[PDB]
Structures are given as C-alpha cells and as structure tokens.
Design a protein around this ligand. Structure first.
Ligand SMILES: [Mg+2]
Ligand SMILES: [Mg+2]
Lengths: 470, 470
C-alpha cells in the first residue's frame, strides 16, 4: 500500500457535503489540513495552484519506476555500462529530501542545522564513528550548493535510488578502483560529481527530450491519480474568490494532464454538465520558471492555444477571457487579479520553489501538499508505541539506555523505509520537516482536504513563546 | 533604571559558590541561562568569547549618548546643518533590531516574515491603512540588502535614534521640500539612502578615526560594566576546557578594555594574586572580521604585543604561549585547539555575525548575550497582566474586541519604549526574537549566568513536534 494508493482510495469516494459529515471527515488525520500559522480563509481572495504533484499526483511506485528505467536507458545509451540495465527501481530505499554529497558520493539525511542523521555510501549505512573521517563535525554546510544537492521533489525519487545503485555498482565492480572522490577505470577517472551531473542531465533529458511524457499520457490511468471532487472544490473556490494556475510545465503537457484530471461525465458535481478544465481558472500561466517567477521572472508571453506555440513578442495587453500566459512573474498575477500577497493562497508541493520562495520573496500565504503524508500518517499512528517509547527513554536518560535509544530509533525508522520518515530520524526532525513548519502556513496529504472546511474557516495555531516568556 | 544599571547591580555582588545558593540564584530569570536547544555542558571542550557588548558591556544611556553626540558633530563638520547640534540622545525611542528603509526613510519593526509591526517616519508612527501606500502588502523583502538595513547591534542604537531625528528635522524645516525618496534644497537633492550612508559613514568614522575610543578609555568606570566574578568564571572554564577570545576589535583597544575588566586587587577570587587578562586565554585572536571569519576569513597575522602593530608577513608557526593572533578564520581556532565545532561554545551579542554565522557555517554551539534582557525581564514580569489580557482576548476573538486588542498591544508595547520590546509587538514576535530561537542554543542577560550552573549541567529544551505529530 503506497501513499498514492491511499490517495486514490480517498479520490474514489464521492463528496458528502452534509455539514456534519464534513466535520467528522476532517477530524481524521488523512483528511485534515494541518496548521503552522493561523490563517483566516475569509481573507483569501485568490487561490493559486501548481500542477505536477499538486493537482496531478503521479502514482507510486509505477511513475518512479518509469522515470528510473528511462533514466537508466539514457545513461546506457551515452556509454554507461550494460550492468545498469539489471537495476530495478526499489521504492523501499529512497526517502525524499536527502542530500547528495558530490565530493564523497554519499546520500545524507540531515536536520535543519546540517547535522548528519543518516549517511549511506551506495547501500552501506555508515554509523557515527565512521562518518567522522569525512565529516569531522558530523555536519555539512548545506548552502555550499556546488557540493551538496538537495533532492527536494518527488521527481527526484528515481535519481535518489539510482545514485545509490551506481555508487554500489562501481564500488563492487572489479573493473573500477575506488578513490575518495570517485572511480578509476584505467586512464579514465569518474568523480562522484561528474557521475551525479550525468544522472541529473539524464533525468532532465528523459522529461524534456525523451519518451517519459509520451508514455505517461498514453496510459494516464496507470500513472495519474484522478478525483471527481477536484472540480467541486475549484468551483467552490471560484464562488468566493479567484482561481489561478501557475505551473512550470508547458502548455501542451498541461492541457493533456489537466484534461484528464477533469475527464468525468459531469462538471463540479454528478448530474452537472462537464466543462473544460480552463473554465475553472480566472488566470492560467504556464512556463512559470519558479522560483525565478517570484523575483524578476521572465518576459510575459501569450500562448497560441490552437498550436501550443508561443505567439511572437511580449504580450502587453489586458487579462481577457480565454487567454493563456507563459512566463512573466508573480507580479503579473497580482496586477491582473487585483491582489496583494496576503490575499493569495498558493498551493504546491515544491518546498523550495513553490513555498519557501513565494513566502520569503512575496509574503504569499502558502499551502504545502505532501503526497507521502497519506501513508506516513498510517505508519505514525500504527507505530505510535515505538515513538512513545523513544520519548520516554529520552526523558529517563535526562549505558544500556543509550543503546536502547539507538535500537528503538532504528526500528521506528525502518517502518518507513531504508531512509526513514520524510520528517524525522527517531527524535530528530529533518531539514524538510523544519522547512515545512517555517514556510508552509498550511499543509496536508492533498489540497482536496480544503473541501472539508467551510468558506470562512479560521485555521488556528498556538502562539509561539520564547523560553524567557514561559 | 536601565538594563546596564541592572547588570552593574548584579556585577557588584560577590559570588556565593555554595551549591544551594547557586541553584536558588539561577532560578531567578535575571540569573538564568535560557535554552532553545538542549546542550550537554560536559561535551563542551572550548569556550570562545566576543569582547564588545559580551565581555565589555557599555553603560546605558551614557555610551549611546557619547556615540550620538560624536556622530552628530562629525555630520555637522562635513556640512550637515547646525540644528543637528540641538539634538540630544533619547533612550526611550530606539529599540534594537529595527530596519531602516533607505527608499522611503522609515524605521520598521518587522516579524520573521517581513510583516510590518511598526512603521515610523521620523517620530510619526504610521498606522496600518496609511502604511499600505508605501507597503501594499504590509511586507518587506528583508534580504533586499541594497534597500533595507537591519540595525542589529547595541552600537546601532545611537544611529537608530539619529535617523529618526534627521527625518523629523528635514521634514519640518521649511528650507527643505519633502519628496517620496528624500529632500530637496534648491538645486541639491538628498535621498534618504545618501543620508543613511552619511550616518553610517559618520558612525564608522567616530569609532575608527574620531575620539570615541579615547573618550571611552579615559573614563572606563563611566562607560563600561565591570564584574569581579568574570575571572572566577573564566578560571573555572579553564579547569575543564580551553578558553579563547575571537574579537573584531584591534589589539590596542582590546588590551585597554580587557585590562580594565580584570582590574581588581585579586585574581579569580578575593585573596588570590591578580593575573593579567591574557593568562585566562589559551588563544587570543583580534581583528577577527566576523562573519567573514567563519568562511575564508583573512590571512593569519601575528601581533607584536609590545608595539600593538602586526608583524610583517603571514604567521606560519605553531600555537605558543604569549602569542597573539590577528585575522585568520574559525578553522585557525579549531586546528590550534584540536576542536570540532560542536565541542565549541561561542559566546557573543551579534545575532548575525557571532551567532547565526558560526551556527550555519560551522555547526558551533552558540550562546547569545542579550544585555537589554536584564531590564526587559523586569517589564515582562511587572506588566504580565497586560500580556495575559492580550492572550485572553486573542482566544476570545477566536468589533470592540479588535479595538481592545490594538489598545492593549499599544499599552503593553509603550512600557518598553516608543519602539516596544526587542522581542515582540503585542502577540507578534519580532525577526530578532525568531532569530534568537533558531540560532542561539543558549541565551541570557549576561554570559556570567553560566557561573551559576555546575560543570556538567544538561541544559534542556523540549522536543519540537509537527502539527500532524500532535
Ligand atoms: Mg509540483
Ligand atoms: Mg560584540
């Protein structure tokens, strides 16, 4: 049972809009919207969306497996060894938000301060004392972006696993000699950095120049979660405010995915006429180039929706019905919708490019979609006894207790996968968790959970007090 | 009663090291060390210090008034109008950590997200609706460092007030015409930015080329808090670890201040021989250039302590007794003391240059000294009924309540001064407060509060849980 299985099971259910039914449903963690900072829904005038892994959640592990297979085939085609073809995607290995250290070839799980929680070289998990050789302070400087790459999106799951496969492969293949910073093969030296760059390039290529999109769209039911409640929520949002799309995807791909997401024999609710996906949006913007979008952005262009090509020139005209924009900036949205940042709730899955950047650069309100939460919630509740035990031990310690703490931490983490929870390793929160709390005003397993709250709901979070104020 | 008066009253008291006396004393907020993240003191191998506003806390408002007077005199001497000489420093106006907006000439008090809590143009406090003309989203992008300057240190208190005085003066002097971005005086245009730059330059000049240091050192009792307990604490630290000084001040000024700080007829305790300040440090480093110090730093130089001049050349030798360093990097300290970052507790008052940067760049443990806390604690407890009222109203609201909330917020804030608490405006925390919580592992009114805790004390903070984990 993957997180997408959970999401699809919930997507299959019709909306019961009886107000008591709604209250009961949203009390379940699965259908709840979680609150980091208080947000009065009555003050939101514009609801903005990302598409991929927000509106269009790709099914797991099928979509990751497809990306993996095509990325491997691209690497082989440029001259990586044939043994790569014997790799098979394994969903139990990668957790999102890991850091690849391009100097030493390690996947790292870190906290908000760059402290090492987990270090794997290939499939070898390096324990504390051994990590000190390469990380003397068990710490990385994560903003050293030339060295460290943070694998922040669900698109990075395939390459997270592939990096580990490759390091494992070269390390154990007697054709190659392992060095500190890569592999020697006679007169050829392959650094972990140049290897990482090849993987990154092959991933981009598969999405942009390869067959991934074509294979996705030829079997959308296999690859994409679909939910009859989506037009209902969007139509309700449009009753109290404006609705926009701002996506990095191009027009042709957006049109294919979005058509599928609305492809039901009805519109907002069963019995109503179907309407085109475009009719649910006051403003549609593609090729957004987030996060650059939230600063200078790019030249505002107009899509010719008939051909899917951009019209020649900068678009200087007004917002008109049926127009589709390309590029621009977040200011385009504010100016055309008559909005200020705090009137906007932007809904996306990219913790950096969607959420942190719109928050820091523009003061937008933020809603983070975390698709894996759909299944992490199940583990969290099902294994609560292990977390509680750890919480009791930590308090008792403040030795056989220290070893017990390490053992319980391991058992708890393994319930999530080999790289543990997205949100923690034992009692230590990850960088990703800390960024969620600081930048996402609201978060949930799905944006659909907004449907279960009334129009002027006040999302509440307790005030933060300093230690001396307590 | 200023915060320095509180600090000096406590400094005047002898240390009672009876273990029960110690426990009782540190329970008082004034003498407490506050904990943002748990820290096991037994793991600290090196204790590092800043000097100014850390070891050498300057007396308030006398020191600010001296800086102000000399800065004004410097501005007049370069051609600012004579009316500046009628300004007098007023401690009730500035709060630390305000943001000067160089485009519009406003002092801003903001939260961690750039939201406006207070906006003053001169001594005119602009209320919410009027701030929207210049700040349509009541928000600034604070990392736009070309536009916004954060007045982060106690050295910036004089210029905080002076900026307000100047804006007030030009606005109300009929020789000048007020524009959006500065003042016209016939064929001369003075932007708020060029005005701000003149103030900033005059402040630097007074410290570097003017008479401020000379006037400080000629009357150290008037200007500097002195405490017989300082050598006691340092000598205890030296029993369990290494002690270093890393300061931006130069050798001659450091030597004058430090001599005064140790100038008692005894050493660590009454009855013991006096020892030179240098003997309390395993490593002494001046001209540190923090925060650059915590990255590449500068060339490591050796001070000729006889002349106060640098020896010619890069110092390539070992740590030797009596040597004094200049420049270098934080790696100099780790390499010479045999330390890793998490073995180091660095003690300073500069939230950015001392604390945030050593934490983010190096993974050092951090202790933030907040001298104003000495008096903010008194107001916090004395006016607790106003904060409690506000907390009850906020909860009741979740109208005459909204107006009551604004009135109580104002009354509470005014108890601290015209720009309110360093830590909040009503129920909203400032940027400074949020940075304290995120980057300072420990904080206190004075570093001396460490004396009241035993050698292997475990400072405890509760674990943070995400909303879905609660
Ligand atoms: Mg996305
Ligand atoms: Mg200082």
């Amino acid at each position: 049972t993957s997180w997408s299985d959970r999401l699809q099971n919930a997507a299959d259910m019709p909306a019961n809009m009886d107000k008591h039914a709604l209250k009961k449903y949203r009390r379940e963690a699965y259908h709840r919207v979680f609150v980091n900072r208080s947000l009065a829904m009555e003050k939101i005038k514009c609801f903005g969306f990302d598409m991929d892994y927000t509106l269009a959640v790709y099914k797991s592990p099928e979509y990751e497996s497809l990306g993996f297979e095509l990325t491997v085939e691209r690497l082989v085609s440029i001259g990586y060894p044939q043994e790569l073809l014997s790799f098979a995607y394994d969903s139990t290995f990668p957790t999102r938000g890991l850091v690849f250290d391009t100097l030493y070839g390690n996947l790292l799980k870190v906290d908000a301060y760059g402290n090492l929680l987990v270090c794997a070289h290939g499939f070898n998990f390096i324990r504390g004392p051994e990590t000190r050789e390469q990380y003397p302070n068990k710490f990385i400087q994560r903003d050293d972006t030339e060295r460290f790459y943070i694998l922040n999106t669900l698109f990075n799951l395939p390459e997270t696993y592939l990096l580990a496969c490759l390091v494992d492969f070269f390390t154990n293949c007697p054709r190659y000699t392992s060095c500190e910073t890569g592999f020697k093969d006679g007169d050829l030296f392959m650094s972990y950095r140049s290897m990482f760059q090849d993987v990154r390039d092959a991933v981009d290529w598969v999405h942009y120049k390869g067959s991934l999109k074509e294979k996705t769209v030829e079997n959308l039911e296999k690859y994409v979660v679909k939910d009859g409640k989506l037009p209902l929520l969007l139509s309700r949002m449009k009753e109290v405010g404006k609705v926009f799309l701002a996506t990095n995807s191009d027009y042709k791909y957006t049109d294919k995915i979005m058509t599928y997401l609305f492809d039901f024999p009805h519109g907002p609710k069963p019995g109503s006429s179907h309407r085109p996906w475009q009719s649910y949006f006051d403003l549609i913007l593609v090729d957004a180039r987030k996060p650059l979008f939230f600063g200078e952005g790019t030249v505002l262009r107009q899509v010719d929706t008939k051909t899917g090509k951009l019209k020649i020139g900068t678009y200087t005209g007004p917002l008109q019905h049926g127009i589709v924009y390309s590029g621009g900036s977040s200011d385009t949205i504010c100016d055309l919708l008559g909005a200020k940042g705090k009137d906007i709730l932007y809904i996306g899955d990219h913790i950096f490019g969607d959420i942190l950047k719109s928050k820091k650069r523009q003061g937008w309100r933020t809603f983070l979609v975390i698709p894996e939460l759909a299944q992490e919630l199940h583990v969290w509740t099902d294994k609560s006894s292990l977390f509680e035990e750890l919480q009791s031990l930590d308090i008792f310690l403040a030795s056989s207790i220290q070893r017990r703490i390490k053992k319980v931490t391991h058992d708890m983490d393994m319930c999530y996968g080999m790289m543990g929870s997205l949100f923690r390793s034992g009692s230590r929160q990850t960088l990703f968790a800390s960024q969620v709390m600081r930048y996402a005003d609201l978060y949930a397993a799905s944006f659909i959970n907004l449907l279960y709250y009334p129009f002027s709901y006040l999302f509440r979070a307790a005030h933060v007090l300093m230690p001396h104020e307590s």
